[PDB]
Amino acid sequence: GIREKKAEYFAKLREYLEEYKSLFVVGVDNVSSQQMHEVRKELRGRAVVLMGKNTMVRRAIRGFLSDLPDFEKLLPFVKGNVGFVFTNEPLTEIKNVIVSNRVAAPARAGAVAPEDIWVRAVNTGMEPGKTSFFQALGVPTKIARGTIEIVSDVKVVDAGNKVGQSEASLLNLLNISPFTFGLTVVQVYDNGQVFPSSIL
Amino acid sequence: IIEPSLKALASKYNCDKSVCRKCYARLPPRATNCRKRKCGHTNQLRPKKKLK
Amino acid sequence: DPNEVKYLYLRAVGGEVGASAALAPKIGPLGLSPKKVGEDIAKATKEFKGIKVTVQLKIQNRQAAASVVPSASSLVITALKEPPRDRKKDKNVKHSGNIQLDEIIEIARQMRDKSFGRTLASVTKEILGTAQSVGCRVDFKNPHDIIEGINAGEIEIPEN
Amino acid sequence: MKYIQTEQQIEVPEGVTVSIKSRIVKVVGPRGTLTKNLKHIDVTFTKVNNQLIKVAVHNGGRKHVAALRTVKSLVDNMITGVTKGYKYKMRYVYAHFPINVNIVEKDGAKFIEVRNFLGDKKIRNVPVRDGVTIEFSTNVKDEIVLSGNSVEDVSQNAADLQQICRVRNKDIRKFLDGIYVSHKGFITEDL
RNA sequence: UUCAUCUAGACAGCCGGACGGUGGCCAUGGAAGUCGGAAUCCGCUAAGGAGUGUGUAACAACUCACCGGCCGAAUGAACUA
Ligand SMILES: [Mg+2]
Ligand SMILES: [Zn+2]
């Protein structure tokens, strides 16, 4: 049934191409089904979010480029877990609606941390024995009657640096949530010329 | 008492295993056949029983 | 801190003197007298006697605040409108009596706000699925038949 | 089925030289030189461009072409052992008795001495295979690290350390005491 | 041998999601996918079973079917002797 299903997907993708004038290439990495549910709910009527397997999308895009050749720039941008948010509305407000959902997880183990960790001086309150993370990573602190208290601000990891297991678990029990998870538009197709999302 | 990290490490070698029905051999957890020829390399395998 | 606010959605048979031996185990730790909760549950679900309906309980300052969760299934049952059942002895009550499209559609209207369904048609399809679970018939048609018809457009659900 | 030709590619980085006489492989890197006898395997090595070796089996059976890939993996292990090295980190797991593990000299033999395992009065001795370095890791509680060029020696000595500390006459699911490899990686980080 | 999957991207591998109506209905004292019987829908969907297993007093928390990310060429099952 792959023939009929993929053909249907190609057809609907075309229809989105014609009606919707512009597009939001989005980095949907680490976006829960529920998270996308509210995001699409917000985008109801306003825009639409279509999802496809990158290779399937690319094959369709070549085929559709056959007649609309304005998409070779789109060809590289279909990489990794990325959703085509089709839009016939103002890109600025579309970008806002995309940005909104940032459900923060504490130091998701392994994933590339997108934020510059500043562990502010705070009474941890967490149990003494678990100092192991602090002690292994240095992180000067003070064990006062079990309840350790971070003495000074420590940058264990940063943005763009995959959290090592140790610090990841450390901020996991420390309940600092840097891993704001929400679809992050990487590029935005604009009526014939894609531009990096940043501007919007 | 052993902390859960070390306990998982030790269970990885002691308990996260398989057992052959015919020859009681201790096999890798995801093994499909027994490695002993005396059982005919049977595929009659079970998970090694978990503690409590 | 009494200011602590804690939500306690629990599905329970309505309008009757609910199981203390089920409700106390939860409120107890929070410092909450079982009886008062019991009055709140019974009064709030009075209409739903013999109708197992979810009821949220807000808790703050060692008090309760009942609010009968408009659960789609229980709303469906109330639409079936069965007078208080002798659930104690009337076990296996096959509550599949018929309902005109009116009530199901209105329930779908009630539930659309949270539901993600882009059309009142879709939300009605959801509630009809709930009725399928119930066994409840809709106007001498299987609720799946109604769902398919609505998809076809023949049962045009008014969008508002 | 006797595949006509099966081939595998061995990538040679910049700082290593591979000299292959008949089936004796001598790999030289920054960390040292390893040598392996592979005369038991009947394969053909051929240099392509001094950064690529091709190892091939002609008209070989199923087992023969399996052992071809085994040889490729062994030479790759040699090259990564002379480039990055190998480190196996073992943690000591104990419920009641801390396991007293240290390095002792007996006639200049470099034995890893184990005492108090399950409270045992026996002294367990693990020889150190030549080329394997032992360091006891600070900032991690009860962790011993075995490092070296040769993965065979490093992992084998770690395996002897693990095997000598097996529990007898007890439910091994409950009596989880022992010395277990918690990490197996390379000495130089993230190369 | 037969049946399937595969450049419209196969199998395995590793990583992401794995929802909402809804604790679906009936029972149990408790049963919220997961002690039982029967119902397997609908929506949001790239996608998720009224659930494949671990688990709880029930929860929860995990895991999988399903779809996704990477690599890019063959692969899986049941059979026959
Ligand atoms: Mg005994
Ligand atoms: Zn066996």
XYZ file of C-alpha atoms (C1' of nucleotides) and ligand atoms in Angstrom:
686
model
C 0.000 0.000 0.000
C 3.094 2.174 -0.001
C 2.477 3.211 -3.613
C -0.992 4.608 -2.937
C -0.082 6.069 0.460
C 3.067 7.851 -0.731
C 1.213 9.071 -3.830
C -1.503 10.528 -1.596
C 1.158 12.173 0.565
C 2.773 13.679 -2.541
C -0.590 15.004 -3.749
C -1.475 16.612 -0.419
C 2.038 18.048 -0.165
C 1.565 19.636 -3.593
C -1.783 21.093 -2.581
C -0.130 22.600 0.485
C 2.614 24.003 -1.774
C 0.117 25.818 -4.013
C -2.374 27.153 -1.462
C 0.078 27.977 1.327
C 2.478 30.590 -0.051
C 5.261 30.250 2.548
C 6.733 27.633 4.827
C 8.455 27.029 8.173
C 11.167 24.378 8.182
C 11.072 23.371 11.850
C 13.509 21.401 14.041
C 10.913 19.253 15.796
C 13.581 17.291 17.675
C 12.479 16.207 21.161
C 8.895 17.432 20.760
C 6.323 15.288 22.543
C 3.165 14.271 20.713
C 1.258 16.316 23.278
C 3.548 19.309 22.712
C 2.868 19.238 18.988
C -0.807 18.792 19.852
C -1.056 22.151 21.614
C 1.191 23.809 19.014
C -1.038 22.647 16.152
C -4.104 23.617 18.212
C -2.699 27.148 18.443
C -1.868 27.061 14.724
C -5.379 25.883 13.782
C -6.753 27.875 10.868
C -3.772 30.188 11.174
C -1.281 27.781 9.561
C -0.754 24.026 9.216
C 2.010 21.604 10.234
C 2.761 18.738 7.842
C 5.156 15.901 8.687
C 6.932 13.485 6.372
C 9.894 11.153 6.195
C 12.774 13.310 4.920
C 13.534 11.014 1.972
C 9.855 10.842 0.985
C 9.610 14.630 1.253
C 12.754 15.101 -0.842
C 11.530 12.767 -3.582
C 8.246 14.668 -3.699
C 10.130 17.987 -3.711
C 12.287 16.992 -6.689
C 9.148 15.838 -8.481
C 7.389 19.102 -7.685
C 10.440 21.197 -8.528
C 10.014 19.676 -11.980
C 7.353 22.367 -12.526
C 8.121 24.780 -9.630
C 11.936 25.078 -9.719
C 12.140 27.435 -6.705
C 12.990 24.656 -4.218
C 16.586 23.468 -4.734
C 17.341 25.655 -1.710
C 14.657 23.674 0.125
C 16.392 20.419 -0.854
C 19.224 20.569 1.752
C 16.915 21.945 4.449
C 14.942 18.663 4.469
C 17.368 17.017 6.884
C 16.801 15.348 10.221
C 13.570 15.582 12.169
C 12.014 18.643 10.540
C 8.378 19.547 9.898
C 7.001 21.686 7.082
C 4.735 24.264 8.728
C 2.858 25.573 5.692
C 1.588 29.130 6.049
C -0.449 31.656 4.068
C -0.283 34.170 6.944
C 2.239 36.622 8.484
C 5.480 34.830 9.226
C 6.211 36.933 12.327
C 3.128 35.794 14.242
C 3.587 32.268 12.870
C 7.112 32.293 14.337
C 5.725 33.513 17.662
C 3.160 30.694 17.811
C 5.931 28.200 17.038
C 8.321 29.628 19.651
C 5.775 29.643 22.487
C 5.964 25.989 23.635
C 9.235 25.493 25.574
C 8.380 22.735 28.059
C 11.610 22.529 30.054
C 13.107 19.173 31.125
C 16.003 19.057 33.614
C 19.198 18.141 31.730
C 17.879 15.388 29.474
C 20.698 12.827 29.474
C 22.779 12.728 26.293
C 20.937 15.247 24.124
C 22.846 18.331 23.001
C 22.232 20.946 25.672
C 21.014 24.150 23.947
C 21.604 26.476 26.934
C 24.616 27.929 28.772
C 24.256 26.280 32.185
C 24.677 28.701 35.079
C 24.022 26.725 38.277
C 23.058 29.578 40.589
C 23.956 29.438 44.282
C 20.922 27.688 45.795
C 20.106 25.490 48.770
C 19.779 22.137 46.994
C 17.755 20.500 49.768
C 18.489 17.169 48.103
C 19.858 14.350 50.247
C 23.541 14.442 51.322
C 24.723 11.012 50.112
C 24.101 11.997 46.488
C 27.013 14.511 46.660
C 28.791 12.100 44.285
C 27.871 14.190 41.223
C 29.052 17.436 42.856
C 32.277 15.872 44.133
C 33.116 14.169 40.829
C 32.545 17.381 38.855
C 34.254 19.557 41.498
C 31.459 22.151 41.705
C 32.443 23.786 45.050
C 29.525 23.431 47.480
C 28.942 23.003 51.211
C 27.254 20.039 52.914
C 25.380 21.725 55.780
C 23.517 19.153 57.915
C 22.811 16.996 54.891
C 21.189 19.772 52.841
C 23.996 20.844 50.516
C 24.036 24.474 49.382
C 25.660 25.563 46.119
C 28.284 28.114 47.139
C 29.105 29.606 43.725
C 27.895 29.658 40.134
C 29.343 26.800 38.054
C 29.059 26.276 34.279
C 29.186 22.475 34.187
C 28.036 22.413 30.543
C 26.954 24.977 27.954
C 24.839 25.372 24.844
C 25.861 23.124 21.972
C 27.750 20.707 24.247
C 26.172 17.264 24.685
C 25.528 16.799 28.395
C 27.857 14.238 29.885
C 25.976 11.588 31.875
C 27.320 12.957 35.168
C 26.225 16.593 34.841
C 23.026 15.552 33.054
C 21.945 13.440 36.029
C 23.306 16.154 38.346
C 20.914 18.776 37.008
C 18.244 16.067 36.787
C 18.157 15.681 40.563
C 18.999 19.387 40.987
C 15.703 20.146 39.155
C 17.256 22.931 37.086
C 15.463 22.528 33.737
C 17.612 23.849 30.856
C 16.287 21.481 28.179
C 13.372 23.592 27.043
C 11.756 21.297 24.490
C 9.736 22.855 21.699
C 9.891 22.742 17.917
C 12.576 25.250 16.870
C 12.100 26.542 13.323
C 15.468 26.236 11.590
C 14.572 27.956 8.291
C 11.529 29.765 6.886
C 10.566 29.629 3.205
C 9.476 33.117 2.092
C 7.559 33.309 -1.217
C 10.506 32.192 -3.336
C 13.486 32.700 -0.995
C 14.081 30.810 2.242
C 15.687 32.774 5.050
C 17.004 31.608 8.436
C 14.215 31.737 11.032
C 16.271 34.026 13.303
C 14.985 37.298 11.796
C 11.328 36.545 12.582
C 23.011 -2.709 50.630
C 24.357 -1.692 47.211
C 23.471 1.593 45.538
C 21.190 1.212 42.492
C 23.859 2.198 39.940
C 26.267 -0.510 41.078
C 23.359 -2.919 41.550
C 22.352 -2.431 37.916
C 25.983 -2.912 36.903
C 26.192 -6.202 38.824
C 22.802 -7.408 37.576
C 23.988 -6.727 34.024
C 26.411 -9.634 34.492
C 24.649 -11.818 37.085
C 20.912 -11.518 36.391
C 20.298 -9.921 32.965
C 20.768 -13.346 31.401
C 18.917 -16.214 29.756
C 18.752 -19.895 30.715
C 18.508 -22.898 28.411
C 15.673 -25.267 29.321
C 17.420 -28.483 28.313
C 20.906 -27.900 29.738
C 20.371 -25.052 32.259
C 23.184 -23.134 30.560
C 23.538 -19.450 31.375
C 23.264 -17.572 28.080
C 23.308 -13.937 26.971
C 19.972 -12.220 27.628
C 19.114 -11.761 23.940
C 20.497 -15.117 22.754
C 18.338 -17.162 20.385
C 20.132 -20.524 20.734
C 22.173 -22.237 23.424
C 25.918 -22.270 22.828
C 26.399 -25.799 24.216
C 26.440 -28.641 21.702
C 25.256 -31.135 24.329
C 21.762 -29.607 24.085
C 21.813 -29.482 20.290
C 22.061 -25.665 20.330
C 18.390 -25.541 21.225
C 16.220 -22.442 20.998
C 14.238 -23.487 24.095
C 15.328 -20.542 26.216
C 13.774 -18.668 29.125
C 14.696 -15.539 31.052
C 16.745 -16.224 34.149
C 14.336 -15.778 37.044
C 14.508 -12.359 38.682
C 15.069 -12.009 42.408
C 11.939 -11.255 44.455
C 1.466 25.544 54.104
C -2.339 25.676 53.867
C -2.101 27.764 50.674
C -1.074 24.562 48.839
C -3.602 23.876 46.066
C -3.960 20.254 44.944
C -6.258 18.844 42.250
C -7.926 15.488 42.964
C -9.873 14.368 39.896
C -11.465 11.004 40.851
C -14.131 9.117 38.903
C -16.833 7.920 41.304
C -20.442 6.754 41.233
C -22.429 9.938 41.582
C -25.084 11.231 43.939
C -24.676 8.417 46.463
C -22.802 8.066 49.731
C -19.500 7.073 48.186
C -16.948 4.667 49.568
C -15.259 6.239 52.565
C -12.928 3.222 52.347
C -11.885 4.559 48.935
C -11.914 8.351 49.397
C -10.293 8.643 52.843
C -6.998 6.917 51.748
C -6.251 9.965 49.570
C -7.547 13.035 51.426
C -6.371 11.672 54.795
C -2.656 12.357 54.300
C -3.607 15.867 53.123
C -5.376 16.591 56.423
C -8.982 16.347 55.247
C -11.978 14.990 57.147
C -13.594 12.201 55.066
C -17.194 13.131 55.905
C -17.058 16.686 54.491
C -15.619 15.385 51.242
C -18.449 12.849 51.232
C -21.155 15.512 51.470
C -19.410 17.485 48.733
C -19.246 14.467 46.403
C -22.845 13.394 47.015
C -24.349 16.860 46.587
C -22.238 17.776 43.551
C -23.059 14.522 41.757
C -26.700 14.406 42.969
C -27.962 14.532 39.385
C -25.597 11.660 38.511
C -26.800 9.154 41.117
C -26.124 5.760 39.595
C -23.899 7.474 37.009
C -20.176 6.998 37.604
C -18.842 10.480 36.844
C -15.417 12.015 37.339
C -15.352 14.788 39.959
C -12.376 17.059 40.556
C -11.590 18.141 44.110
C -9.547 21.274 44.622
C -7.830 21.235 48.025
C -6.472 24.284 49.861
C -6.370 25.472 53.488
C -7.411 21.970 54.633
C -10.728 22.222 52.776
C -12.344 20.783 49.656
C -13.883 22.239 46.518
C -15.943 19.784 44.483
C -16.599 20.243 40.778
C -18.182 17.443 38.753
C -15.872 16.815 35.792
C -18.038 16.811 32.655
C -16.616 13.480 31.526
C -17.850 12.641 28.024
C -18.889 9.085 28.910
C -20.833 10.088 32.022
C -22.500 12.918 30.101
C -23.488 10.269 27.552
C -24.993 8.151 30.340
C -26.935 11.131 31.689
C -28.152 11.677 28.133
C -29.419 8.094 28.247
C -31.289 9.391 31.323
C -31.620 6.293 33.487
C -33.237 7.071 36.880
C -31.034 6.128 39.871
C -29.931 2.540 39.354
C -29.895 -0.142 42.056
C -26.231 -0.763 41.227
C -25.884 -2.607 44.550
C -28.072 -5.421 43.196
C -28.737 -4.357 39.571
C -25.326 -5.523 38.397
C -24.439 -5.745 34.697
C -26.787 -2.863 33.872
C -26.721 -2.791 30.056
C -27.177 0.978 29.681
C -27.421 1.194 25.900
C -30.807 2.901 25.562
C -31.308 5.099 22.541
C -30.465 8.791 22.321
C -31.445 11.345 19.715
C -28.529 13.103 18.021
C -29.390 16.217 20.070
C -27.743 15.182 23.336
C -24.634 13.627 21.772
C -24.044 16.757 19.699
C -24.540 19.002 22.735
C -22.072 16.871 24.725
C -19.588 17.240 21.873
C -20.122 20.991 22.117
C -19.431 20.749 25.853
C -16.172 18.878 25.247
C -14.833 20.605 22.107
C -12.989 23.271 24.117
C -10.378 20.849 25.469
C -10.592 18.451 22.514
C -8.284 19.093 19.562
C -10.875 18.090 16.933
C -10.939 20.790 14.259
C -14.680 20.318 13.656
C -17.786 19.823 15.766
C -18.351 16.880 13.426
C -15.089 15.373 14.691
C -15.957 16.045 18.330
C -19.333 14.368 17.807
C -17.430 11.444 16.298
C -15.367 11.307 19.502
C -18.471 11.312 21.707
C -20.078 8.701 19.451
C -17.001 6.565 20.040
C -17.625 7.006 23.758
C -21.191 5.845 23.117
C -19.792 2.857 21.207
C -17.839 1.949 24.327
C -21.078 2.366 26.285
C -23.015 0.286 23.786
C -25.463 3.205 23.629
C -27.416 3.319 20.387
C -28.030 6.596 18.552
C -31.365 6.888 16.699
C -31.488 3.177 15.779
C -27.973 3.323 14.288
C -24.615 2.073 15.514
C -22.586 5.140 16.592
C -19.952 4.029 14.091
C -22.670 4.267 11.445
C -23.437 7.805 12.645
C -19.714 8.669 12.578
C -19.347 7.429 9.001
C -22.513 9.275 7.989
C -21.253 12.520 9.526
C -17.990 12.041 7.635
C -20.105 11.661 4.485
C -22.014 14.849 5.359
C -25.501 13.308 5.509
C -25.741 14.002 9.256
C -24.566 17.600 8.992
C -23.545 18.568 12.525
C -24.015 22.354 12.821
C -20.543 23.791 13.278
C -21.550 25.920 16.280
C 28.855 -21.335 -1.473
C 32.400 -20.141 -2.207
C 32.072 -16.430 -2.863
C 34.554 -15.513 -5.595
C 35.872 -12.449 -3.788
C 35.154 -10.924 -0.389
C 36.995 -7.777 0.671
C 37.264 -5.539 3.723
C 38.762 -2.060 4.056
C 41.157 -1.139 6.874
C 41.668 2.610 7.254
C 45.159 3.702 8.325
C 45.355 7.157 9.970
C 48.274 9.542 9.543
C 50.498 8.678 12.482
C 50.623 4.884 12.147
C 52.649 2.575 9.901
C 51.446 -0.958 9.160
C 54.058 -3.486 8.045
C 52.462 -6.783 7.018
C 54.737 -9.693 6.246
C 52.976 -12.934 5.400
C 50.354 -12.832 8.168
C 52.408 -11.142 10.888
C 51.006 -7.633 11.310
C 53.204 -4.963 12.911
C 51.314 -1.737 13.635
C 53.262 1.296 14.863
C 51.551 4.316 16.357
C 52.134 7.144 18.818
C 51.538 4.924 21.852
C 53.642 1.930 20.837
C 53.975 -1.026 18.500
C 51.718 -4.073 18.404
C 52.340 -7.351 16.595
C 49.884 -10.116 15.748
C 50.296 -13.564 14.225
C 47.444 -14.269 11.802
C 48.898 -17.248 9.924
C 45.924 -19.376 10.998
C 43.451 -17.542 8.786
C 44.465 -17.728 5.063
C 43.684 -14.174 3.928
C 45.446 -11.761 1.566
C 46.520 -8.261 2.608
C 47.221 -5.579 0.031
C 48.147 -1.926 0.425
C 46.162 0.455 -1.760
C 47.407 3.972 -1.079
C 49.357 3.805 2.241
C 46.194 4.951 4.047
C 44.060 1.968 3.014
C 44.632 -1.770 3.349
C 42.362 -4.286 1.652
C 42.067 -7.745 3.182
C 40.510 -10.300 0.871
C 39.363 -13.903 0.768
C 39.185 -15.623 -2.619
C 36.840 -18.578 -3.134
C 36.170 -18.853 0.586
C 33.388 -20.562 2.480
C 30.895 -19.021 4.859
C 33.182 -19.519 7.856
C 36.151 -18.272 5.823
C 34.433 -15.004 4.909
C 33.306 -14.633 8.527
C 36.907 -14.924 9.683
C 37.869 -12.331 7.079
C 35.758 -9.749 8.897
C 37.171 -11.011 12.193
C 40.698 -10.286 10.920
C 39.609 -6.843 9.752
C 38.212 -6.093 13.214
C 41.381 -7.353 14.917
C 43.636 -5.151 12.785
C 41.299 -2.212 13.421
C 41.634 -2.929 17.135
C 45.418 -2.903 16.765
C 45.356 0.442 14.966
C 42.989 2.050 17.455
C 45.118 0.653 20.276
C 48.256 2.285 18.925
C 46.407 5.536 18.161
C 44.020 6.069 21.079
C 44.699 3.180 23.456
C 42.128 1.207 25.424
C 40.835 1.736 28.949
C 38.493 -0.545 30.876
C 37.039 0.983 34.032
C 35.858 -1.482 36.673
C 33.793 -0.620 39.720
C 33.777 -2.678 42.893
C 30.272 -3.757 43.906
C 29.865 -4.825 47.522
C 26.921 -5.054 49.911
C 28.704 -5.356 53.265
C 32.458 -5.891 52.949
C 34.531 -3.258 51.132
C 36.754 -5.161 48.717
C 40.404 -4.386 49.480
C 42.114 -4.237 46.082
C 45.669 -3.008 45.642
C 48.836 -3.553 43.601
C 51.549 -5.706 45.183
C 54.995 -6.806 44.025
C 55.959 -10.471 44.380
C 59.370 -11.155 42.817
C 58.654 -8.232 40.503
C 55.434 -9.689 39.110
C 52.836 -6.895 39.543
C 49.905 -8.775 41.070
C 46.531 -7.209 41.853
C 45.789 -8.415 45.385
C 42.185 -8.768 46.569
C 41.193 -9.239 50.210
C 37.936 -9.165 52.186
C 35.752 -10.215 49.238
C 32.645 -11.557 51.009
C 34.756 -11.294 54.143
C 36.938 -14.101 52.833
C 40.294 -14.630 54.496
C 41.652 -15.888 51.175
C 43.998 -13.592 49.273
C 43.081 -13.514 45.591
C 45.892 -12.683 43.179
C 45.525 -11.489 39.594
C 48.743 -11.190 37.552
C 49.046 -8.047 35.466
C 49.384 -8.917 31.791
C 52.431 -7.220 30.315
C 51.626 -3.867 28.752
C 48.579 -3.205 30.937
C 48.719 -0.180 33.241
C 46.648 -0.041 36.434
C 45.505 3.192 38.017
C 43.028 3.591 40.860
C 40.715 6.423 39.937
C 40.241 9.307 42.346
C 36.898 11.214 42.358
C 35.153 7.854 41.749
C 34.620 5.555 44.727
C 36.137 2.077 44.300
C 37.096 2.179 40.618
C 40.166 0.583 39.031
C 41.217 1.444 35.473
C 43.190 -0.908 33.221
C 44.769 0.739 30.178
C 46.990 -0.343 27.338
C 47.577 -0.569 23.633
C 46.212 -4.090 23.202
C 42.500 -4.564 23.820
C 43.138 -8.292 24.146
C 45.467 -7.880 27.127
C 43.479 -5.048 28.721
C 40.121 -6.803 28.494
C 41.616 -10.179 29.387
C 43.169 -8.852 32.584
C 39.903 -7.105 33.441
C 38.143 -10.426 32.790
C 40.518 -12.308 35.101
C 39.871 -9.683 37.771
C 36.133 -10.149 37.272
C 36.301 -13.955 37.260
C 38.491 -14.325 40.342
C 35.799 -12.470 42.337
C 32.864 -14.783 41.600
C 30.619 -15.781 44.511
C 30.284 -19.456 45.445
C 27.506 -21.343 47.250
C 25.239 -18.275 47.229
C 22.343 -16.823 45.260
C 24.370 -14.724 42.834
C 21.270 -12.616 42.206
C 21.384 -11.433 45.832
C 25.121 -11.689 46.584
C 26.095 -9.279 43.823
C 29.619 -8.726 45.132
C 32.385 -8.502 42.574
C 34.529 -6.347 40.330
C 32.670 -5.420 37.148
C 33.741 -3.545 34.022
C 31.631 -0.390 34.109
C 33.152 1.252 31.047
C 35.143 0.116 28.025
C 36.496 2.954 25.900
C 39.646 4.631 24.680
C 42.360 6.410 26.646
C 42.264 9.634 24.638
C 38.883 11.304 25.016
C 36.421 11.508 22.087
C 38.905 10.722 19.314
C 9.687 -23.761 -1.991
C 6.159 -20.178 -1.017
C 5.104 -15.498 0.922
C 6.389 -10.679 1.854
C 9.783 -5.599 2.578
C 13.147 -2.375 -0.537
C 16.299 4.283 -3.378
C 8.812 6.691 -3.064
C 14.982 4.239 1.390
C 14.436 -2.500 3.200
C 16.271 -5.560 8.225
C 19.281 -4.740 12.272
C 21.587 -1.011 15.076
C 21.517 3.702 18.036
C 18.487 8.299 19.201
C 12.895 11.051 19.192
C 7.702 10.786 19.862
C 4.632 6.772 21.438
C -1.191 11.262 22.660
C -6.570 13.352 23.781
C -11.988 11.896 24.420
C -10.949 8.135 28.411
C -10.017 6.004 35.238
C -13.892 3.640 27.507
C -18.435 -0.291 29.480
C -19.746 -4.022 32.930
C -18.217 -6.048 37.222
C -14.115 -6.413 42.222
C -13.460 -3.920 48.177
C -9.220 -2.154 44.984
C -8.425 -2.877 38.452
C -6.936 4.053 35.704
C -4.158 -0.162 28.432
C -1.968 -4.288 31.284
C -6.652 -9.978 37.848
C -11.681 -10.947 34.619
C -16.090 -10.708 30.322
C -17.467 -8.066 26.065
C -16.868 -3.618 23.066
C -11.649 -2.194 19.538
C -14.124 3.470 17.976
C -13.112 8.551 17.102
C -10.170 12.702 16.901
C -5.391 15.098 16.849
C -2.241 12.786 13.301
C 4.400 11.591 10.465
C 2.247 8.197 14.796
C 0.669 5.539 18.565
C -3.335 -0.855 20.411
C -9.377 1.444 24.566
C -2.637 -1.955 24.560
C 2.856 -5.650 23.756
C 5.424 -6.879 28.257
C 7.823 -4.863 33.619
C 5.105 -2.748 37.566
C 1.309 -0.361 41.562
C -3.439 -1.372 46.665
C -5.269 1.343 42.772
C -2.001 5.082 40.981
C 2.283 6.354 39.203
C 6.612 5.275 36.710
C 8.990 2.165 32.577
C 8.684 -0.803 27.857
C 6.815 -2.231 23.328
C 3.390 -2.535 18.640
C 2.962 2.402 15.263
C 5.505 6.476 13.121
C 9.840 9.338 13.013
C 16.236 10.702 12.950
C 20.982 8.709 11.135
C 23.619 5.170 7.471
C 22.406 3.694 2.319
C 21.435 -2.183 -0.430
C 19.569 -5.713 -0.250
C 16.352 -8.190 3.590
C 12.639 -10.970 6.675
C 9.351 -15.105 7.832
C 7.368 -19.840 7.469
C 8.540 -24.139 5.278
C 11.234 -28.483 2.260
C 15.291 -32.086 2.445
Mg 22.565 -21.750 50.572
Zn 21.280 -25.562 25.863
